[PDB]
Design a binder for this molecule. Structure first.
Ligand SMILES: O=c1[nH]ccc2cc(OC[C@@H]3CCNC3)c(Cl)cc12
Length: 312
């Protein structure tokens, strides 16, 4: 399931070859081009690495901390130099400079899926089929090669580009960076994680199932919509604490019927089973009818994407 085609290996090799020419990352080597997004911890800027000429995404995290803590965070982030996959955003490096930690990454010209969703209104099932494959594969890569789980799957942590690539970013790899920061939305957290119980990759499967439902209907799906709201979209206010209680206490969300295929509905239902033991695992998801159908579909994701967001 983790093997790569010719095109993937070549792109992966081309990234590392460009990366090896960068060298030590320093504050003054960066020119700000624009702001890409702002989210958990800090702001992401599209930047120019002046010496190499490489365009990168630079995430700045404002943190006032002793040289002790910052040197440990930088050392902990070095793990990301080992995470080489078509389904994971490329990492250039991390450094600290005058009150802020910088994380330099591959620039994904399509931005994140929370932004694409805002532009599209809702994302078609076939496009979501490609997103699901990429997420499952990214999570399998993290689990198999690095024995780590994502911990924060959500639309804003799924990045897309004009080449039709879909990649995960912002997975927990440093405890010290988490402690010092620490603020993140808990709205995609599985019922077991919100109950402080037994948490594995199964909790990332729930977050993926939830992100897919949001993207398919064009709305965060908790609480479920009424008969009237479903007529508005297809023709055919809760405070954060009330929402987290709703997730733990009520049946999981689901796709509306007679709008989505039964394979897509079943796929999300198997990600959203409250009990993590009954919830589908990565191995089972990889062979689910929805994945096998989406995998065999020839879907122009780059085409759909550039048309939708006006990229070009
Ligand atoms: O160009 C990408 N590379 C790495 C990270 C990244 C993060 C994205 O922004 C994430 C923010 C967080 C909440 N809204 C979107 C931007 Cl839109 C592009 C990139």
């Amino acid at each position: 399931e983790l093997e790569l085609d010719e095109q993937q290996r070549k792109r992966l090799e081309a990234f590392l070859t460009q990366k090896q020419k960068v060298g030590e990352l320093k504050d003054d080597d960066f020119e700000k081009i624009s702001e890409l997004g702002a989210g958990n911890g800090g702001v992401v800027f599209k930047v120019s690495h002046k010496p190499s000429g490489l365009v990168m995404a630079r995430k700045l995290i404002h943190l006032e901390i002793k040289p002790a803590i910052r040197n440990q965070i930088i050392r902990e982030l070095q793990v990301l130099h080992e995470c080489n996959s078509p389904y994971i955003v490329g990492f250039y490096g991390a450094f600290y400079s005058d009150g802020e930690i910088s994380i330099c990454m591959e620039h994904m010209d399509g931005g994140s899926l929370d932004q694409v969703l805002k532009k599209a209104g809702r994302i078609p099932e076939q496009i979501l089929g490609k997103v699901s494959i990429a997420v499952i594969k990214g999570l399998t890569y993290l689990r198999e090669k690095h024995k780590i789980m994502h911990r924060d799957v959500k639309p804003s942590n799924i990045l897309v580009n004009s080449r039709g690539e879909i990649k995960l970013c912002d997975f927990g790899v440093s405890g010290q960076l988490i402690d010092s920061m620490a603020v993140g939305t808990r709205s995609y957290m599985s019922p077991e994680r919100l109950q402080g119980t037994h948490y594995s990759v199964q909790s990332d499967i729930w977050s993926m199932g939830l992100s897919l439902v949001e993207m398919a209907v064009g709305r965060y799906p908790i609480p479920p919509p009424d008969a009237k709201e479903l007529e508005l979209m297809f023709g055919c206010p809760m405070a954060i604490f009330e929402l987290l209680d709703y997730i733990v206490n009520e049946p999981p969300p689901k796709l509306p019927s007679g709008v989505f295929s039964l394979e897509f509905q079943d796929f999300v239902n198997k990600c959203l089973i409250k009990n993590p033991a009954e919830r589908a695992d990565l191995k089972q998801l990889m062979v689910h009818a929805f994945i096998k159908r989406s995998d065999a579909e020839e879907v122009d994701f780059a085409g759909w994407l550039c048309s939708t967001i006006g990229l070009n």
